[PDB]
Amino acid sequence: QISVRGLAGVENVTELKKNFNRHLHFTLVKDRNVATPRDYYFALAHTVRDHLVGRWIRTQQHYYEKDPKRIYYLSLEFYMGRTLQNTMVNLALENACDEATYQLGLDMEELEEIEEDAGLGNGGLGRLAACFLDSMATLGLAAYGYGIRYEFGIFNQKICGGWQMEEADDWLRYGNPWEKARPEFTLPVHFYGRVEHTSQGAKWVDTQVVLAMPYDTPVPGYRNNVVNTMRLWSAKAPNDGYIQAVLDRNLAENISRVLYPNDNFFEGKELRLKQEYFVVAATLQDIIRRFKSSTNFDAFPDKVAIQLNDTHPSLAIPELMRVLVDLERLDWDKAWEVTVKTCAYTNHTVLPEALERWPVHLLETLLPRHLQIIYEINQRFLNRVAAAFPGDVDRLRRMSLVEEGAVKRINMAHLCIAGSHAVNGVARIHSEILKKTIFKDFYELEPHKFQNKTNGITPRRWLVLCNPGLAEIIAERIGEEYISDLDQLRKLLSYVDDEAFIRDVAKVKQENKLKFAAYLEREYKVHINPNSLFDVQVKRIHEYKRQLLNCLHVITLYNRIKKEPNKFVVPRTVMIGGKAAPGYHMAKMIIKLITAIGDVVNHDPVVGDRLRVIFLENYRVSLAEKVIPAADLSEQISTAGTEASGTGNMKFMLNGALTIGTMDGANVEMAEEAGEENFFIFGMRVEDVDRLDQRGYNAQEYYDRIPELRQIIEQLSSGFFSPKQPDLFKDIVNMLMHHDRFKVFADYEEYVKCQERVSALYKNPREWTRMVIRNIATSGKFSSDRTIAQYAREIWGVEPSRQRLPA
Amino acid sequence: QISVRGLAGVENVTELKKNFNRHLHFTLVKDRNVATPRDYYFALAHTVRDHLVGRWIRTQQHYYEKDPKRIYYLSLEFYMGRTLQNTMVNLALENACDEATYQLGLDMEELEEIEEDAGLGNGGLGRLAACFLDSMATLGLAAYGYGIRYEFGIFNQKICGGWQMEEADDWLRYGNPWEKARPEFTLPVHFYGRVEHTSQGAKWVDTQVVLAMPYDTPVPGYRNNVVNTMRLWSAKAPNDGYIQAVLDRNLAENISRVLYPNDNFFEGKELRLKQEYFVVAATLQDIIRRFKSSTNFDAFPDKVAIQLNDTHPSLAIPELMRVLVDLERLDWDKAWEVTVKTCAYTNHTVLPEALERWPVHLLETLLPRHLQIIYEINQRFLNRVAAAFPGDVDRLRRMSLVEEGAVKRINMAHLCIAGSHAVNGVARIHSEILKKTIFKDFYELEPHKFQNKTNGITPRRWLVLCNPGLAEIIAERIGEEYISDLDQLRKLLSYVDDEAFIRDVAKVKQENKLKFAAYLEREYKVHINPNSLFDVQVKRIHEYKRQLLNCLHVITLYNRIKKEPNKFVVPRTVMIGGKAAPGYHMAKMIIKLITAIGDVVNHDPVVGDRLRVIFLENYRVSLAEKVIPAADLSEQISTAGTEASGTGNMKFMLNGALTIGTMDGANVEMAEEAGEENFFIFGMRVEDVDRLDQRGYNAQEYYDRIPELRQIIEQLSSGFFSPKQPDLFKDIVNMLMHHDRFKVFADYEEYVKCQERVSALYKNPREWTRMVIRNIATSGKFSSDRTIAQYAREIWGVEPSRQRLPA
Ligand SMILES: O=c1[nH]c(=O)n([C@@H]2O[C@H](CO)[C@@H](O)[C@@](O)(CO)[C@H]2O)cc1F
Ligand SMILES: O=c1[nH]c(=O)n([C@@H]2O[C@H](CO)[C@@H](O)[C@@](O)(CO)[C@H]2O)cc1F
């Protein structure tokens, strides 16, 4: 049907059809008379999987022959979403399968909707890991993703009476056709025990053993025949009154049961520590095994790179020391040199409550040897500090891996910097902030460790897969090469005054909005005007992300309409979506506020269809693929200095939404790439936030001087939005007024004014679209292919390659 | 190679080879260079499974079109063992696969050894269920096996320092290629709650829901293209702080976690009650669903038969009442008529400690509605009793489903008799004992309910599969028809004086012994003389089975050798094997005694290779398939009146061992079929046991009069067999002397004398073999095909059919 979706040759369609029928019969044990749509999805999924395996086996064979340096990406999160369409895209089978299933009388799109998301992540950091695997395969790097096969991923979000309810995400219920269990590669992991010192060094004894069983999932590169591996570990009890003993096997296996649903918040629970060691201990054994099948660990850093996605797998550092010192009998100094040269660390936040600071008594019980290695690391590190800054006793306590206080803690971030040859932030402004503030001391010691690697997104999932209409009209004009070289989108700048392109871009957006508006009614009974501006804020719910600022704007628009009902306003559909961590009370209250606003606004006859406020339930990867292409306005409104990067922002820019936001995270590089005139920037810069802090933030001041703001607060306090419980929102008002760490009021005036400028541009469709073209055309930098190429060259020491492997 | 194993046509071998290669590549994702023997087993298993599915789909289709009466076999145990070879046998693919794997350079037999047993049973009762499924498919009955998919089956038995150690049987670790998950057919099961009475009858409310997910395993008939279904239910939690809530899902799912390892012993644990209801509640919903897709439940008993394998699924009775009365709104009397006509009950023991007597307080909490239905059943039943035996108040309390006492209990056996149209024992003597003793009262009320159905074994697994050599020499002479008409073995009587046959029978036995002797050294480092008589007792360890009597004989032989070292004795290898329930202390002590005897006997240089005592570790189905063909003497020595049937006995008769035993269980019918002269019968009959009881059993008497017995006891008491702990066996001696319920001493003299007659026959190879021929030739009655044909005609009301379905 459309050209980017590949060829539907007669040989391929015929081959796919009979393989579909084979799997339905032999694999699913069904016939056409009893098969449900779910059986058809599986038959298609198995048929597509068949095309992967040949390439998968040869890719692993190739890496064995050639023996290149291997990249190990360690993450506790891999937010993969669905695999079927993505696999088709990267294999050029999309049209072929469309044809083949059409001829069998089935609608492929309907079948795609049946696949469960692999929601093995929380948000940005987990999805970054997913985009990265895609890009690594597309760039032909010998790269492995390592993590945990959670039985339950991020919870499904249900709204009941406007409240979030969490229900277990049981994504393996019907099975996962993509994974291959590899029980033969099972590995022991140790916990508890004690440390013995012998003549021949320390020994870790009396441990409890948990077995780690790997599952391999294929990661196909874009049309290059490269298929890399994602290896996820599952917890299994060893085989050594009776009934209870068997039932107690669940204790060991609980390790891989459930993903912790905190985003940007540290919770010091033991089960989470067990998860962190489990992935690290099994992964490192696997790495060393593969290394030995190529005595001399000098070459280890030439053959191995290990990337740490945040501090979650930071125990890789003392674990590698443990293995090298205790088991391989290398001397400390040589083992340490190997470790530093092998490991690299990526930071994703500067919020102090997000930093992992493990109580020493936990590490002592669970990992007594690792605590000893950490104390030894800390001591030798502090000796370097003392030697470089003699007499500076305060530097010593600031830089320590060990924090003193009520309870002693290990600062895992300090550990990562000391034990890594490179430390990076995830956007330029974030990388600068790390150097100026929380890691200043470390930067002064070792300036050469600190780098920037601005985040990116994969244009395969985030353009071709979710927005074929837009990919097609672009391909019509500039070809297909841009899909793996997103810089080529610049060529689109010479179409900015082209009447045909302007009409096509706008037509694609209209189609996406129509389709999404239909999806809203069919799956969630909600009535929206598709001619309105689609104003969307989707991301995890957090105070720093300031969904509350958005709420205040929405209430302002409503109050303005009610004040002058017969005045013309640009109509809007305001969509806010995202999950709150189950114990984050404030986040839960914000979700409730949003729905309460919708209850009032959406049922006011005076408002008409001019303003609708929708909360998007169960925001997740597959919902993102639908709403992002349909958006006109992307809300990226974090208080300056708090959002490390953002990647949602990039998804919107790539798909033809304009951005309203602060000079925060990657926003800064986006505006810089598109031109500030092509972006809606408002609010305090980082420096303004600092000035406000030194002086003191007094929210009363804004309440006293802005009548429109005062009215909103009075409405909140008095029960306008909660008529049956007048004081339902006292916590929110109280926080806004007395302890807002994120200065919602300080940005309010500028935000509202900037929002008027957006509405004005929207009234002029042609100029709106011309600005969109200028965004799409400069989004090339934000490809994860660029990001990974920089990781590869400046951290890992490997050259990317665009070259095909033989078919 | 051998004719009973089918054709190895060139088309088939070629087809099998490429399908093997297909599965290795696409299903296992391996190539010939990285594949282990385990990968090869799986590739073969998937290849064979492919031949089943076509037939499986058409068999289920056929039953839909024709709509015959359906048999539902409800059991908590299905002791299946391995599936690969059995599937090959029943499909006539054995030689073809042998050829095909040989050409790929693999040894099929080596690959077969890799398959884990499905040990979803304890012993006799579980294996009966397995033989039955085979026979039902072979007889073309529309029959379904229903049970529980235990995650862990019967424990693996390890011997350490001569003690039993139990380790978890993790049989699903590497996956099970035979099962098909059917998550789409998932069904809710209810527990706890309370009962509400409305205008419109009783309602069961506030229940906890556990989901039952079915797994279907194919059951192929013998060369008839019939493939029936075994459906095993798995426990799943429904999808509705947070972390703990998810971890607590294990509580619900523990229902199908582990098989209770008691044999002939009731343990009143709640988890076991949950298992019993779980299988019954999900199974009945499935039955009724299938019935409705053919309002009028009059026809229900014409379309449904439900067989209860012991009292374990007895809750089917009040559950069917519950569904019919509470949900379908039939009146009591009509529902009851339907229930009785639908249900039938098989008893497997008369030992009072084996009978299920559930505490009322358990049923009250867990199943409050079922308790009400039971009280109502009991009341109306006792009204029939009162009306038939007016004034007999003691009959009323004896026959009650409710037992009075310290704690009130439900007698589940009384429930089954009242709610079933037929009740059967499992051998003629056992069926008579039920009528004369424990169920006398019930027999006098309803004589027409009581039947006999003597047990059988399947000649497919128990001759063709495990003893191809013997099946072949038989086929040479009488053809192949006997495999599904085992009565034809009679034709072998005219070969009893045939010199060629005599030599062939004996040659096959010698080969089996050689092969098993090799297996002993290769897998368990033990040195045995293959010219010795193989004296084997394999079965669960239990006092009534009298492994202890066997021990006393063994010690006697040893004491006789030591007394006259230079006198000739027929050499023996004495093999005893079987698992003890983990909490059955006495059973555990008997295992220890056996090994201790081996420690003394096997290392005495005076004994030479004349007497060896081996304990066979981890006795299970696949070990039975090896040891049974190698046996010369089958030990079946239970105290008369205690062993309901036995089926091990039948396995030995079929495979050319002679039997030493008591007139107990099926032994009686075996001797009657072969002629008493062709059998080694000894000891008290049932009547003698009764006489001894009335008078009183005084073991001291035998100790005072039998010097050889006195010496053995003195050896036990004084530490001859336990030199480091002289009093290790005080419990055993004490039991033998003061509270032996099974009268070991009373049978001792006769047992030893009968054992001398065995040795004498063994000295004359030709006459030994002629007697063997007379056993094999009369074992036809003991085919499970005969058993199931009698169940079908006299209980279920369906005609068996030997006719092929189209290929
Ligand atoms: O716990 C965390 N979880 C998480 O998803 N991020 C995110 O990591 C992303 C990837 O670097 C960034 O783009 C981000 O700025 C917005 O999601 C950042 O907040 C950062 C954390 F600290
Ligand atoms: O709990 C039990 N488990 C069990 O396996 N059987 C057996 O059920 C078999 C099948 O009917 C019989 O042959 C038997 O006599 C010897 O195993 C009998 O003991 C009887 C029980 F009661």
By Cβ distance, the residue of B56, B237, B257 closest to A247 is B257
CB atoms within 10 A of CB A214: 23
B290 is in an annotated binding site: yes
Give the whole-angstrom CA distance, residue B507 versus residue B518. Answer: 17
Query: Measured from the CB, is residue B123 less than 6 Å from ligand 2?
Result: yes
Residues of A labelled catalytic? 348, 539-540, 545, 647, 651
By Cβ distance, the residue of B173, B241, B269 closest to A582 is B241
* Cβ <8 Å between B56 and A166: no
C-alpha A310 to ligand 1 mean position (Å) = 9
A293 is in an annotated binding site: yes
Nearest listed ligand to the Cα of residue A454:
1
C-alpha B425 to ligand 2 mean position (Å) = 11
C-alpha distances (whole Å) from A696 to each of A109, A242, A689, B648 are 55, 65, 10, 88
Give the whole-angstrom CA distance, residue A254 versus residue A237. Answer: 10
* Cβ <8 Å between A241 and B582: yes
B393: exposed, middle or buried (C-beta count within 10 Å: 0-12, 13-18, 19+)?
exposed
- Within 8 A of B173 by CB-CB distance, chain A residues are 183, 236
Token code pair at residue B1: 């190679």
Closest residue in chain A to residue B153, using alpha carbons only: A246
Encode burial over B46-61: b for 16+ CB neighbours within 10 A, e otherwise: bbbbbbbbebbbbbbe
Give the whole-angstrom CA distance, residue B244 versus residue A507. Answer: 49
C-alpha B219 to ligand 2 mean position (Å) = 23
A703 is in an annotated binding site: no
Of B149, B348, B435, B461, the catalytic one is: B348
Q: Work out which ligand 1 atom sits closest to the CA atom of A540.
A: 17
Query: Which residues approach ligand 1 with their CB closer than 6 A?
Result: A 122-125, 128, 263-264, 348-349, 354, 426, 455, 643-647, 665
In the DSSP assignment, the letter for residue B25 is I
Which residue, among A77, A106, A203, A110, has the nearest Cα to A522 in the 3D structure? Answer: A110
Give the whole-angstrom CA distance, residue A573 versus residue A505. Answer: 20
Token code pair at residue B285: 């919903």
Q: Tell me which CATH code domain B457-783 carries.
A: 3.40.50.2000
Which residue, among A325, A293, A255, A276, has the nearest Cα to A63 in the 3D structure? Answer: A293
H, E, C per residue of B770-781: HHHHHHHCCCHH
Which residue, among B593, B611, B605, has the nearest Cα to B556 in the 3D structure? Answer: B611
- Within 8 A of A170 by CB-CB distance, chain B residues are 239
Which residue, among B123, B149, B154, B283, has the nearest Cα to B217 in the 3D structure? Answer: B149
- Within 8 A of B241 by CB-CB distance, chain A residues are 582-583
Give the whole-angstrom CA distance, residue B785 versus residue B722. Answer: 48
Dihedral sign of CA atoms B140, B144, B145, B150 in order: positive
C-alpha distances (whole Å) from B627 to each of A548, B121, B153, B470, B623 are 76, 19, 22, 14, 6
Angle between helices A124-138 and A784-791 (to 10 degrees): 80
How many CB contacts within 8 angstroms connect chain A with chain B? 95
Chain B nearest C-alpha distance from A77 (Å): 17
- Within 8 A of A181 by CB-CB distance, chain B residues are 175
- Within 8 A of B251 by CB-CB distance, chain A residues are none
Is there a catalytic annotation at residue B361? Answer: no
* Cβ <8 Å between A243 and B258: yes
Is-contact B127 B135, C-beta < 8 A? Answer: no
A149 is in an annotated binding site: no
For a mutational test of ligand 2's pocket, the pick from B348, B643, B668, i.e. the residue with the most ligand atoms closer than 8 A to its C-beta, is: B348
The amino acid present at A342, given as its one-letter code, is T
Is-contact A118 A765, C-beta < 8 A? Answer: no
Q: Work out which ligand 1 atom sits closest to the CA atom of A665.
A: 15
Chain A nearest C-alpha distance from B206 (Å): 20
Which residue, among A465, A466, A462, A630, has the nearest Cα to A532 in the 3D structure? Answer: A630
Dihedral sign of CA atoms A417, A420, A422, A424 in order: negative
The amino acid present at A531, given as its one-letter code, is N
Q: Whose alpha carbon is nearest atom 1 of ligand 2? A: B264
Is there a catalytic annotation at residue B190? Answer: no
H, E, C per residue of B480-518: CHHHHCHHHHHHHHHHCCCHHHHHHHHHHHHHHHHHHHH
Strands B572-577 and B611-616: parallel
Is-contact A293 A786, C-beta < 8 A? Answer: no
Of B409, B414, B509, B545, the catalytic one is: B545
B511: exposed, middle or buried (C-beta count within 10 Å: 0-12, 13-18, 19+)?
middle
C-alpha A349 to ligand 1 mean position (Å) = 7
Nearest listed ligand to the Cα of residue B353:
2
Strands B180-181 and B201-220: antiparallel
CATH 3.20.20.20, applies to B1-456+784-807: no
B291 is in an annotated binding site: yes
Token code pair at residue A362: 């936990």
Q: Give the residue range(s) of CATH 3.40.50.2000 domains in chain B.
A: 1-456+784-807, 457-783
Q: Work out which ligand 2 atom sits closest to the CA atom of B262.
A: 1
Query: Measured from the CB, is residue B665 less than 6 Å from ligand 2?
Result: yes
Which residue, among A270, A301, A255, has the nearest Cα to A149 in the 3D structure? Answer: A255
Closest residue in chain A to residue B22, using alpha carbons only: A50
Q: Is B119 helix (H, G, I), strand (E, B) or coil?
A: strand
For a mutational test of ligand 2's pocket, the pick from B266, B349, B635, i.e. the residue with the most ligand atoms closer than 8 A to its C-beta, is: B349
The amino acid present at B250, given as its one-letter code, is N
The per-residue DSSP string of A249-316 comes to: HHHHHGGGTB----SS-----HHHHHHHHHHHHHHHHHHHHHHHT---GGGHHHHEEEEEESSTTTTH
Chain A nearest C-alpha distance from B84 (Å): 17
By Cβ distance, the residue of B38, B167, B184 closest to A184 is B38
- Name residue A403's beta-bridge partners: A409
Give the whole-angstrom CA distance, residue B451 versus residue B447. Answer: 9
Token code pair at residue B619: 């006795």
Chain B nearest C-alpha distance from A226 (Å): 16
For a mutational test of ligand 1's pocket, the pick from A120, A125, A634, A638, i.e. the residue with the most ligand atoms closer than 8 A to its C-beta, is: A125
For chain B, the C-alpha Rg in angstroms (whole number) is 27
B700: exposed, middle or buried (C-beta count within 10 Å: 0-12, 13-18, 19+)?
exposed
Q: Is A603 helix (H, G, I), strand (E, B) or coil?
A: coil
Q: Is B164 helix (H, G, I), strand (E, B) or coil?
A: strand
The amino acid present at B558, given as its one-letter code, is Y
Is there a catalytic annotation at residue B651? Answer: yes
Which residue, among A563, A577, A492, has the nearest Cα to A534 in the 3D structure? Answer: A577
Encode burial over B615-639: b for 16+ CB neighbours within 10 A, e otherwise: bbbbbbbbbbbebbbbbbbbbbbbb
Which residue, among B291, B276, B278, has the nearest Cα to B212 in the 3D structure? Answer: B278
The per-residue DSSP string of A201-255 comes to: EEEEEEEEEEEEEEEEEEEE-SSS--EEEEEEEEEE-----HHHHHHTHHHHHGG
Chain A nearest C-alpha distance from B61 (Å): 10
Closest residue in chain A to residue B256, using alpha carbons only: A247
Token code pair at residue B564: 């006259």
Chain A nearest C-alpha distance from B488 (Å): 38
C-alpha B661 to ligand 2 mean position (Å) = 17
Is-contact B72 B307, C-beta < 8 A? Answer: yes
By Cβ distance, the residue of B152, B174, B246 closest to A152 is B246
In the DSSP assignment, the letter for residue A494 is G
Residues in chain B: 807
